[PDB]
Assembly symmetry: C3
Homo-oligomer: 155 residues x 3
Protein backbone atom coordinates (compact mmCIF):
# COMPACT_ATOMS: atom_id res chain seq x y z
CA UNK A 1 0.00 0.00 0.00
CA UNK A 2 2.44 2.50 1.31
CA UNK A 3 5.12 0.51 -0.37
CA UNK A 4 6.63 0.83 -3.86
CA UNK A 5 7.56 -2.17 -6.01
CA UNK A 6 11.12 -2.17 -7.38
CA UNK A 7 12.57 -4.73 -9.80
CA UNK A 8 16.23 -5.24 -10.72
CA UNK A 9 16.78 -6.22 -14.36
CA UNK A 10 20.45 -7.25 -14.13
CA UNK A 11 23.42 -7.85 -11.80
CA UNK A 12 24.67 -4.33 -12.64
CA UNK A 13 21.55 -2.69 -11.18
CA UNK A 14 21.59 -1.17 -7.70
CA UNK A 15 18.64 -0.74 -5.33
CA UNK A 16 17.46 2.90 -4.97
CA UNK A 17 18.21 4.50 -1.59
CA UNK A 18 16.38 7.03 0.58
CA UNK A 19 18.98 7.19 3.38
CA UNK A 20 17.24 10.04 5.22
CA UNK A 21 13.54 10.45 6.03
CA UNK A 22 14.40 14.13 5.44
CA UNK A 23 15.01 13.50 1.71
CA UNK A 24 12.24 13.75 -0.89
CA UNK A 25 13.67 11.41 -3.53
CA UNK A 26 15.38 8.08 -4.16
CA UNK A 27 19.01 7.84 -5.28
CA UNK A 28 19.24 6.38 -8.79
CA UNK A 29 22.44 4.58 -9.83
CA UNK A 30 23.87 4.00 -13.30
CA UNK A 31 24.09 0.39 -14.51
CA UNK A 32 26.45 1.55 -17.29
CA UNK A 33 29.92 2.95 -17.80
CA UNK A 34 29.87 5.48 -20.66
CA UNK A 35 31.98 8.36 -21.97
CA UNK A 36 30.04 11.41 -23.19
CA UNK A 37 31.75 13.74 -25.66
CA UNK A 38 30.70 17.43 -25.97
CA UNK A 39 27.16 17.83 -27.41
CA UNK A 40 26.67 14.04 -27.26
CA UNK A 41 23.25 12.67 -26.25
CA UNK A 42 22.50 9.31 -24.60
CA UNK A 43 19.94 7.30 -22.62
CA UNK A 44 21.67 5.73 -19.60
CA UNK A 45 20.30 2.35 -18.47
CA UNK A 46 19.65 1.96 -14.74
CA UNK A 47 18.41 -1.63 -15.21
CA UNK A 48 15.67 -0.82 -12.67
CA UNK A 49 11.88 -1.05 -13.04
CA UNK A 50 9.23 0.57 -10.82
CA UNK A 51 5.47 -0.02 -10.55
CA UNK A 52 3.99 3.36 -9.64
CA UNK A 53 0.29 3.07 -8.66
CA UNK A 54 -2.37 5.12 -10.45
CA UNK A 55 -2.91 8.70 -9.28
CA UNK A 56 0.84 9.33 -9.12
CA UNK A 57 3.65 10.37 -11.47
CA UNK A 58 7.36 9.63 -11.07
CA UNK A 59 9.95 12.33 -11.75
CA UNK A 60 13.31 10.84 -12.75
CA UNK A 61 15.24 14.06 -12.20
CA UNK A 62 18.75 15.48 -11.80
CA UNK A 63 20.85 15.82 -8.66
CA UNK A 64 21.97 19.35 -7.74
CA UNK A 65 25.61 18.33 -7.15
CA UNK A 66 26.12 16.81 -10.60
CA UNK A 67 24.14 19.44 -12.56
CA UNK A 68 25.80 22.48 -10.95
CA UNK A 69 29.35 21.11 -11.27
CA UNK A 70 29.28 19.39 -14.68
CA UNK A 71 27.80 20.18 -18.11
CA UNK A 72 25.72 16.99 -17.76
CA UNK A 73 22.11 18.01 -18.41
CA UNK A 74 19.37 15.55 -17.44
CA UNK A 75 15.93 16.08 -18.96
CA UNK A 76 13.50 15.09 -16.19
CA UNK A 77 11.51 11.99 -17.16
CA UNK A 78 7.83 11.59 -16.28
CA UNK A 79 7.39 7.99 -15.14
CA UNK A 80 3.82 6.93 -15.98
CA UNK A 81 1.87 4.93 -13.41
CA UNK A 82 1.94 1.47 -15.00
CA UNK A 83 5.20 1.61 -16.97
CA UNK A 84 7.19 -1.50 -16.00
CA UNK A 85 10.09 -1.04 -18.45
CA UNK A 86 13.73 -0.08 -17.92
CA UNK A 87 14.16 3.37 -16.36
CA UNK A 88 16.40 5.36 -18.71
CA UNK A 89 18.24 8.60 -18.01
CA UNK A 90 17.73 11.18 -20.75
CA UNK A 91 21.11 12.90 -20.65
CA UNK A 92 23.17 15.35 -22.71
CA UNK A 93 26.73 16.63 -22.28
CA UNK A 94 26.02 20.31 -22.94
CA UNK A 95 29.70 21.27 -23.01
CA UNK A 96 30.41 22.93 -26.29
CA UNK A 97 32.44 21.24 -29.01
CA UNK A 98 35.44 23.58 -29.25
CA UNK A 99 37.56 21.08 -31.26
CA UNK A 100 40.25 21.17 -28.52
CA UNK A 101 41.62 17.96 -26.99
CA UNK A 102 42.89 16.91 -23.54
CA UNK A 103 44.72 13.89 -22.06
CA UNK A 104 42.07 13.27 -19.37
CA UNK A 105 38.28 13.24 -19.12
CA UNK A 106 36.44 14.28 -15.95
CA UNK A 107 34.04 12.61 -13.49
CA UNK A 108 30.57 13.57 -12.21
CA UNK A 109 32.32 15.77 -9.63
CA UNK A 110 34.02 17.67 -12.50
CA UNK A 111 37.42 16.47 -11.22
CA UNK A 112 40.12 15.35 -13.67
CA UNK A 113 40.58 11.57 -13.90
CA UNK A 114 44.26 10.57 -13.98
CA UNK A 115 45.00 7.46 -16.06
CA UNK A 116 47.96 5.08 -16.19
CA UNK A 117 47.72 4.96 -20.00
CA UNK A 118 47.70 8.19 -21.97
CA UNK A 119 44.65 8.71 -24.16
CA UNK A 120 43.43 11.69 -26.19
CA UNK A 121 39.87 12.80 -25.38
CA UNK A 122 38.01 15.88 -26.63
CA UNK A 123 37.94 18.77 -24.14
CA UNK A 124 34.82 18.72 -21.95
CA UNK A 125 34.35 14.95 -22.02
CA UNK A 126 32.72 13.23 -19.04
CA UNK A 127 32.63 9.62 -17.86
CA UNK A 128 29.81 8.09 -15.84
CA UNK A 129 30.73 4.86 -14.05
CA UNK A 130 28.74 1.79 -13.00
CA UNK A 131 27.00 2.32 -9.64
CA UNK A 132 27.21 6.12 -9.47
CA UNK A 133 24.66 8.56 -8.00
CA UNK A 134 23.67 10.57 -11.10
CA UNK A 135 19.89 10.95 -10.76
CA UNK A 136 17.01 10.80 -8.26
CA UNK A 137 13.38 9.65 -8.37
CA UNK A 138 10.58 11.79 -6.89
CA UNK A 139 6.96 10.58 -6.89
CA UNK A 140 4.22 13.24 -6.93
CA UNK A 141 0.38 12.91 -6.82
CA UNK A 142 -1.54 13.91 -9.97
CA UNK A 143 -5.03 15.10 -10.89
CA UNK A 144 -6.36 13.53 -14.11
CA UNK A 145 -9.94 14.74 -14.77
CA UNK A 146 -12.02 14.17 -17.92
CA UNK A 147 -11.69 16.91 -20.54
CA UNK A 148 -14.72 18.96 -21.60
CA UNK A 149 -14.49 21.26 -24.63
CA UNK A 150 -15.83 24.68 -23.65
CA UNK A 151 -16.61 27.79 -25.72
CA UNK A 152 -16.10 30.25 -22.82
CA UNK A 153 -14.89 29.47 -19.28
CA UNK A 154 -17.08 29.20 -16.14
CA UNK A 155 -16.12 32.61 -14.71
CA UNK B 1 -15.60 19.16 -10.53
CA UNK B 2 -13.46 16.30 -11.61
CA UNK B 3 -13.47 17.81 -15.02
CA UNK B 4 -11.06 20.27 -16.66
CA UNK B 5 -12.19 23.10 -18.94
CA UNK B 6 -10.45 23.27 -22.33
CA UNK B 7 -10.93 26.00 -24.94
CA UNK B 8 -9.80 25.97 -28.58
CA UNK B 9 -8.67 29.37 -29.87
CA UNK B 10 -8.53 28.54 -33.60
CA UNK B 11 -9.27 25.92 -36.28
CA UNK B 12 -5.60 24.85 -36.11
CA UNK B 13 -5.90 23.81 -32.45
CA UNK B 14 -6.33 20.16 -31.50
CA UNK B 15 -8.02 18.76 -28.38
CA UNK B 16 -5.57 17.29 -25.82
CA UNK B 17 -5.68 13.50 -25.48
CA UNK B 18 -5.21 11.10 -22.58
CA UNK B 19 -5.67 7.87 -24.56
CA UNK B 20 -4.74 5.59 -21.64
CA UNK B 21 -5.91 5.78 -18.02
CA UNK B 22 -2.35 4.54 -17.40
CA UNK B 23 -0.87 7.86 -18.62
CA UNK B 24 -0.22 10.80 -16.28
CA UNK B 25 -0.43 13.63 -18.82
CA UNK B 26 -2.34 15.06 -21.77
CA UNK B 27 -0.90 15.09 -25.29
CA UNK B 28 -0.31 18.67 -26.47
CA UNK B 29 -0.33 19.39 -30.21
CA UNK B 30 1.31 22.23 -32.13
CA UNK B 31 -0.99 24.70 -33.91
CA UNK B 32 2.02 25.96 -35.90
CA UNK B 33 4.47 24.83 -38.56
CA UNK B 34 7.92 26.29 -37.82
CA UNK B 35 11.55 25.64 -38.74
CA UNK B 36 14.06 25.99 -35.89
CA UNK B 37 17.69 26.69 -36.79
CA UNK B 38 20.55 25.74 -34.40
CA UNK B 39 20.52 27.83 -31.18
CA UNK B 40 17.19 29.40 -32.22
CA UNK B 41 14.56 30.06 -29.55
CA UNK B 42 10.77 30.23 -30.02
CA UNK B 43 7.38 30.07 -28.27
CA UNK B 44 5.15 27.61 -30.14
CA UNK B 45 1.42 28.40 -30.12
CA UNK B 46 -0.92 25.52 -29.26
CA UNK B 47 -4.00 27.75 -29.61
CA UNK B 48 -5.40 26.00 -26.52
CA UNK B 49 -6.55 27.49 -23.20
CA UNK B 50 -7.10 25.67 -19.90
CA UNK B 51 -8.84 26.74 -16.68
CA UNK B 52 -6.95 24.99 -13.88
CA UNK B 53 -8.78 25.32 -10.52
CA UNK B 54 -7.02 26.78 -7.48
CA UNK B 55 -4.82 24.45 -5.44
CA UNK B 56 -3.26 22.98 -8.58
CA UNK B 57 -0.42 23.80 -10.98
CA UNK B 58 -0.10 22.69 -14.61
CA UNK B 59 3.22 21.44 -15.97
CA UNK B 60 3.49 21.96 -19.73
CA UNK B 61 6.44 19.61 -20.15
CA UNK B 62 8.47 17.68 -22.73
CA UNK B 63 7.84 14.22 -24.15
CA UNK B 64 10.62 11.65 -23.67
CA UNK B 65 10.59 10.52 -27.32
CA UNK B 66 11.18 13.99 -28.78
CA UNK B 67 13.70 15.17 -26.14
CA UNK B 68 15.90 12.06 -26.27
CA UNK B 69 16.00 11.88 -30.08
CA UNK B 70 16.23 15.57 -31.07
CA UNK B 71 18.11 18.63 -29.79
CA UNK B 72 14.70 20.23 -29.13
CA UNK B 73 14.77 21.41 -25.52
CA UNK B 74 11.45 22.36 -23.89
CA UNK B 75 11.60 24.44 -20.71
CA UNK B 76 8.71 23.14 -18.59
CA UNK B 77 6.05 25.82 -18.13
CA UNK B 78 4.19 26.27 -14.84
CA UNK B 79 0.54 26.88 -15.74
CA UNK B 80 -0.99 29.07 -13.01
CA UNK B 81 -4.47 28.22 -11.75
CA UNK B 82 -6.51 30.99 -13.37
CA UNK B 83 -4.46 31.71 -16.50
CA UNK B 84 -6.88 31.58 -19.44
CA UNK B 85 -4.44 32.69 -22.17
CA UNK B 86 -2.82 30.79 -25.04
CA UNK B 87 -0.62 27.91 -23.89
CA UNK B 88 2.83 28.49 -25.39
CA UNK B 89 5.69 26.02 -25.69
CA UNK B 90 9.00 27.49 -24.51
CA UNK B 91 11.37 25.72 -26.89
CA UNK B 92 15.00 25.92 -28.02
CA UNK B 93 16.91 24.01 -30.69
CA UNK B 94 20.04 23.27 -28.66
CA UNK B 95 21.95 21.89 -31.63
CA UNK B 96 25.14 23.84 -31.98
CA UNK B 97 25.68 26.32 -34.80
CA UNK B 98 28.62 24.71 -36.63
CA UNK B 99 28.18 26.87 -39.78
CA UNK B 100 27.72 23.70 -41.89
CA UNK B 101 24.75 23.29 -44.25
CA UNK B 102 22.60 20.37 -45.44
CA UNK B 103 19.95 19.81 -48.14
CA UNK B 104 17.34 18.49 -45.68
CA UNK B 105 16.05 19.37 -42.22
CA UNK B 106 14.80 16.72 -39.77
CA UNK B 107 11.52 15.96 -37.98
CA UNK B 108 10.64 15.45 -34.30
CA UNK B 109 11.71 11.81 -34.72
CA UNK B 110 15.18 13.03 -35.83
CA UNK B 111 14.59 11.45 -39.27
CA UNK B 112 15.68 13.26 -42.45
CA UNK B 113 12.83 14.88 -44.40
CA UNK B 114 13.15 14.31 -48.16
CA UNK B 115 11.84 17.18 -50.29
CA UNK B 116 10.83 17.42 -53.96
CA UNK B 117 12.52 20.83 -54.21
CA UNK B 118 16.12 21.22 -53.12
CA UNK B 119 16.70 23.78 -50.38
CA UNK B 120 19.77 24.66 -48.30
CA UNK B 121 19.22 24.52 -44.53
CA UNK B 122 21.80 24.87 -41.74
CA UNK B 123 22.93 21.54 -40.25
CA UNK B 124 20.89 20.56 -37.19
CA UNK B 125 17.69 22.30 -38.27
CA UNK B 126 14.34 20.89 -37.15
CA UNK B 127 10.78 21.37 -38.37
CA UNK B 128 7.69 21.05 -36.19
CA UNK B 129 4.44 20.57 -38.12
CA UNK B 130 0.82 21.49 -37.41
CA UNK B 131 -0.91 18.86 -35.25
CA UNK B 132 2.19 17.09 -33.90
CA UNK B 133 2.71 15.54 -30.45
CA UNK B 134 5.57 17.68 -29.09
CA UNK B 135 4.59 18.31 -25.46
CA UNK B 136 2.39 17.03 -22.62
CA UNK B 137 0.40 18.63 -19.79
CA UNK B 138 0.60 17.27 -16.22
CA UNK B 139 -1.49 18.80 -13.40
CA UNK B 140 -0.10 18.52 -9.86
CA UNK B 141 -1.58 19.65 -6.48
CA UNK B 142 0.20 22.52 -4.68
CA UNK B 143 0.58 23.82 -1.13
CA UNK B 144 0.46 27.63 -0.90
CA UNK B 145 0.70 28.73 2.76
CA UNK B 146 1.14 32.29 4.08
CA UNK B 147 4.77 33.34 4.59
CA UNK B 148 6.06 34.28 8.04
CA UNK B 149 9.49 35.89 8.42
CA UNK B 150 11.41 34.02 11.11
CA UNK B 151 14.74 34.76 12.82
CA UNK B 152 15.50 31.10 13.67
CA UNK B 153 13.50 28.00 12.65
CA UNK B 154 11.08 26.02 14.88
CA UNK B 155 13.48 23.11 15.52
CA UNK C 1 0.56 24.86 10.15
CA UNK C 2 -0.61 26.35 6.95
CA UNK C 3 2.29 28.69 7.17
CA UNK C 4 5.82 28.42 5.77
CA UNK C 5 8.92 29.55 7.68
CA UNK C 6 11.23 31.92 5.80
CA UNK C 7 14.60 33.20 7.03
CA UNK C 8 16.68 36.05 5.59
CA UNK C 9 20.44 35.44 5.77
CA UNK C 10 21.62 38.97 4.90
CA UNK C 11 20.56 42.58 4.23
CA UNK C 12 20.70 41.83 0.48
CA UNK C 13 17.97 39.17 0.74
CA UNK C 14 14.38 39.97 -0.21
CA UNK C 15 11.21 38.32 1.12
CA UNK C 16 9.49 36.01 -1.42
CA UNK C 17 6.18 37.31 -2.79
CA UNK C 18 2.94 35.64 -3.86
CA UNK C 19 1.13 38.82 -4.95
CA UNK C 20 -1.89 36.96 -6.37
CA UNK C 21 -3.85 34.07 -4.83
CA UNK C 22 -4.10 33.04 -8.50
CA UNK C 23 -0.35 32.31 -8.66
CA UNK C 24 1.12 28.89 -7.82
CA UNK C 25 4.62 29.98 -6.79
CA UNK C 26 6.65 32.49 -4.80
CA UNK C 27 8.83 35.13 -6.49
CA UNK C 28 12.51 34.51 -5.73
CA UNK C 29 14.92 37.46 -5.84
CA UNK C 30 18.69 37.49 -6.41
CA UNK C 31 20.88 38.67 -3.54
CA UNK C 32 23.79 39.02 -5.99
CA UNK C 33 24.90 41.09 -8.96
CA UNK C 34 26.77 38.87 -11.44
CA UNK C 35 27.76 38.89 -15.11
CA UNK C 36 27.42 35.56 -16.94
CA UNK C 37 29.52 35.02 -20.06
CA UNK C 38 28.44 32.53 -22.78
CA UNK C 39 28.57 28.88 -21.56
CA UNK C 40 29.37 30.10 -18.03
CA UNK C 41 27.82 28.26 -15.07
CA UNK C 42 27.05 29.68 -11.60
CA UNK C 43 25.05 29.20 -8.39
CA UNK C 44 23.27 32.46 -7.54
CA UNK C 45 22.79 33.18 -3.83
CA UNK C 46 19.31 34.29 -2.76
CA UNK C 47 20.39 34.55 0.90
CA UNK C 48 17.03 32.99 1.82
CA UNK C 49 16.29 29.83 3.82
CA UNK C 50 13.01 27.88 3.97
CA UNK C 51 11.81 25.15 6.34
CA UNK C 52 9.57 22.91 4.23
CA UNK C 53 7.66 20.38 6.40
CA UNK C 54 7.90 16.64 5.71
CA UNK C 55 5.65 15.20 3.00
CA UNK C 56 6.45 18.08 0.65
CA UNK C 57 9.14 19.02 -1.87
CA UNK C 58 10.10 22.53 -3.00
CA UNK C 59 10.73 23.27 -6.68
CA UNK C 60 13.07 26.24 -7.14
CA UNK C 61 12.23 26.72 -10.80
CA UNK C 62 12.51 29.17 -13.70
CA UNK C 63 10.18 32.00 -14.67
CA UNK C 64 8.67 31.85 -18.17
CA UNK C 65 9.52 35.48 -19.00
CA UNK C 66 13.25 35.15 -18.32
CA UNK C 67 13.68 31.67 -19.84
CA UNK C 68 11.85 32.42 -23.10
CA UNK C 69 13.60 35.77 -23.68
CA UNK C 70 17.17 35.05 -22.54
CA UNK C 71 19.62 32.15 -22.88
CA UNK C 72 19.60 31.89 -19.07
CA UNK C 73 18.82 28.26 -18.26
CA UNK C 74 17.81 27.41 -14.68
CA UNK C 75 18.01 23.76 -13.64
CA UNK C 76 15.04 23.28 -11.29
CA UNK C 77 16.21 22.53 -7.74
CA UNK C 78 14.43 20.03 -5.51
CA UNK C 79 14.28 21.60 -2.05
CA UNK C 80 14.28 18.77 0.52
CA UNK C 81 11.92 19.02 3.49
CA UNK C 82 14.38 19.87 6.27
CA UNK C 83 17.11 21.70 4.35
CA UNK C 84 17.71 24.99 6.18
CA UNK C 85 20.68 26.20 4.09
CA UNK C 86 21.01 29.01 1.55
CA UNK C 87 18.74 28.57 -1.48
CA UNK C 88 20.98 28.65 -4.56
CA UNK C 89 19.97 29.10 -8.18
CA UNK C 90 21.58 26.53 -10.47
CA UNK C 91 22.01 28.64 -13.60
CA UNK C 92 23.81 28.50 -16.95
CA UNK C 93 24.12 31.06 -19.74
CA UNK C 94 23.46 28.71 -22.66
CA UNK C 95 24.35 31.31 -25.29
CA UNK C 96 27.07 29.90 -27.44
CA UNK C 97 30.64 31.17 -27.27
CA UNK C 98 31.09 32.57 -30.79
CA UNK C 99 34.27 34.54 -29.88
CA UNK C 100 32.56 37.80 -30.95
CA UNK C 101 32.49 40.86 -28.67
CA UNK C 102 30.02 43.71 -28.01
CA UNK C 103 30.09 47.03 -26.12
CA UNK C 104 27.03 46.19 -24.00
CA UNK C 105 25.67 43.19 -22.09
CA UNK C 106 21.93 42.52 -21.74
CA UNK C 107 19.45 42.21 -18.86
CA UNK C 108 16.97 39.49 -17.85
CA UNK C 109 14.52 41.04 -20.33
CA UNK C 110 17.10 40.52 -23.12
CA UNK C 111 17.30 44.31 -23.60
CA UNK C 112 20.66 46.01 -24.22
CA UNK C 113 22.08 47.85 -21.19
CA UNK C 114 23.55 51.24 -22.13
CA UNK C 115 26.54 52.29 -20.02
CA UNK C 116 28.23 55.65 -19.41
CA UNK C 117 31.66 53.98 -19.62
CA UNK C 118 32.52 51.86 -22.63
CA UNK C 119 33.46 48.27 -21.83
CA UNK C 120 34.09 45.23 -24.04
CA UNK C 121 31.97 42.18 -23.17
CA UNK C 122 31.67 38.89 -25.08
CA UNK C 123 28.56 38.63 -27.27
CA UNK C 124 25.64 36.97 -25.47
CA UNK C 125 26.64 38.11 -21.97
CA UNK C 126 23.93 38.67 -19.36
CA UNK C 127 23.86 40.54 -16.07
CA UNK C 128 21.61 39.67 -13.14
CA UNK C 129 21.18 42.46 -10.59
CA UNK C 130 20.50 42.51 -6.84
CA UNK C 131 16.77 42.21 -6.08
CA UNK C 132 15.59 40.88 -9.46
CA UNK C 133 12.80 38.38 -10.17
CA UNK C 134 14.74 35.50 -11.77
CA UNK C 135 13.20 32.38 -10.22
CA UNK C 136 10.10 31.08 -8.41
CA UNK C 137 9.44 28.53 -5.65
CA UNK C 138 6.65 25.95 -5.98
CA UNK C 139 5.90 23.47 -3.16
CA UNK C 140 4.35 20.12 -4.14
CA UNK C 141 3.20 17.15 -1.97
CA UNK C 142 5.20 13.91 -2.25
CA UNK C 143 4.66 10.19 -1.68
CA UNK C 144 7.64 8.46 -0.03
CA UNK C 145 6.82 4.77 0.60
CA UNK C 146 9.22 2.04 1.76
CA UNK C 147 10.94 0.14 -1.07
CA UNK C 148 10.41 -3.61 -1.48
CA UNK C 149 12.57 -5.58 -3.93
CA UNK C 150 10.31 -7.69 -6.12
CA UNK C 151 11.07 -10.42 -8.67
CA UNK C 152 7.88 -9.86 -10.72
CA UNK C 153 5.24 -7.14 -10.25
CA UNK C 154 1.80 -7.57 -8.60
CA UNK C 155 -0.18 -7.62 -11.87
O1 LIG D 1 19.27 24.80 -7.22
C1 LIG D 1 19.31 24.32 -6.06
C2 LIG D 1 19.29 22.94 -5.89
C3 LIG D 1 19.34 22.42 -4.60
N1 LIG D 1 19.39 23.24 -3.54
C4 LIG D 1 19.44 22.69 -2.17
C5 LIG D 1 18.06 22.19 -1.75
C6 LIG D 1 18.23 20.71 -1.44
O2 LIG D 1 17.69 20.39 -0.16
C7 LIG D 1 19.73 20.46 -1.45
C8 LIG D 1 20.08 19.18 -2.21
O3 LIG D 1 19.79 19.34 -3.60
P1 LIG D 1 18.82 18.33 -4.39
O4 LIG D 1 17.63 17.82 -3.43
O5 LIG D 1 18.24 19.02 -5.57
N2 LIG D 1 19.75 16.94 -4.93
P2 LIG D 1 20.52 15.92 -3.75
O6 LIG D 1 19.55 15.74 -2.48
O7 LIG D 1 20.79 14.59 -4.36
O8 LIG D 1 21.91 16.59 -3.28
P3 LIG D 1 23.24 16.52 -4.19
O9 LIG D 1 22.74 16.76 -5.59
O10 LIG D 1 24.11 17.63 -3.65
O11 LIG D 1 23.78 15.13 -3.94
O12 LIG D 1 20.35 21.59 -2.07
C9 LIG D 1 19.41 24.64 -3.75
O13 LIG D 1 19.47 25.44 -2.78
N3 LIG D 1 19.37 25.13 -5.00
O1 LIG E 1 14.03 9.73 -18.98
C1 LIG E 1 13.09 8.92 -19.08
C2 LIG E 1 11.86 9.34 -19.60
C3 LIG E 1 10.82 8.42 -19.70
N1 LIG E 1 10.99 7.15 -19.31
C4 LIG E 1 9.89 6.18 -19.41
C5 LIG E 1 8.86 6.41 -18.32
C6 LIG E 1 7.55 6.71 -19.03
O2 LIG E 1 6.50 5.88 -18.52
C7 LIG E 1 7.80 6.39 -20.50
C8 LIG E 1 7.23 7.47 -21.40
O3 LIG E 1 7.95 8.69 -21.23
P1 LIG E 1 7.21 10.07 -20.84
O4 LIG E 1 5.97 9.78 -19.85
O5 LIG E 1 8.17 10.97 -20.17
N2 LIG E 1 6.62 10.84 -22.29
P2 LIG E 1 5.43 10.02 -23.28
O6 LIG E 1 4.37 9.27 -22.33
O7 LIG E 1 4.72 11.01 -24.12
O8 LIG E 1 6.17 8.94 -24.22
P3 LIG E 1 6.96 9.38 -25.56
O9 LIG E 1 7.68 10.64 -25.16
O10 LIG E 1 7.86 8.20 -25.85
O11 LIG E 1 5.86 9.58 -26.57
O12 LIG E 1 9.21 6.28 -20.67
C9 LIG E 1 12.25 6.75 -18.79
O13 LIG E 1 12.45 5.58 -18.41
N3 LIG E 1 13.25 7.64 -18.69
O1 LIG F 1 5.84 27.61 -21.52
C1 LIG F 1 4.93 28.29 -21.00
C2 LIG F 1 5.16 28.91 -19.77
C3 LIG F 1 4.15 29.68 -19.20
N1 LIG F 1 2.97 29.81 -19.82
C4 LIG F 1 1.89 30.62 -19.21
C5 LIG F 1 1.24 29.86 -18.06
C6 LIG F 1 1.43 30.73 -16.83
O2 LIG F 1 0.20 30.93 -16.15
C7 LIG F 1 1.96 32.06 -17.34
C8 LIG F 1 3.12 32.56 -16.49
O3 LIG F 1 4.26 31.71 -16.65
P1 LIG F 1 4.98 31.02 -15.38
O4 LIG F 1 3.88 30.63 -14.26
O5 LIG F 1 5.68 29.79 -15.83
N2 LIG F 1 6.14 32.13 -14.69
P2 LIG F 1 5.59 33.66 -14.05
O6 LIG F 1 4.20 33.44 -13.28
O7 LIG F 1 6.60 34.18 -13.10
O8 LIG F 1 5.38 34.70 -15.26
P3 LIG F 1 6.63 35.46 -15.95
O9 LIG F 1 7.69 34.39 -16.06
O10 LIG F 1 6.08 35.93 -17.28
O11 LIG F 1 6.96 36.57 -14.98
O12 LIG F 1 2.39 31.86 -18.70
C9 LIG F 1 2.77 29.17 -21.07
O13 LIG F 1 1.68 29.27 -21.67
N3 LIG F 1 3.75 28.43 -21.61
NI1 LIG G 1 10.28 19.78 -13.49
NI1 LIG H 1 23.97 24.36 -25.45
Amino acid sequence: TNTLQVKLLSKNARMPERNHKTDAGYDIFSAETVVLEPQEKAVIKTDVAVSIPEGYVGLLTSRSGVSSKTHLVIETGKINAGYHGNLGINIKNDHEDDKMQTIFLRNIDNEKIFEKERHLYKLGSYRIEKGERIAQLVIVPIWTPELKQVEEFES
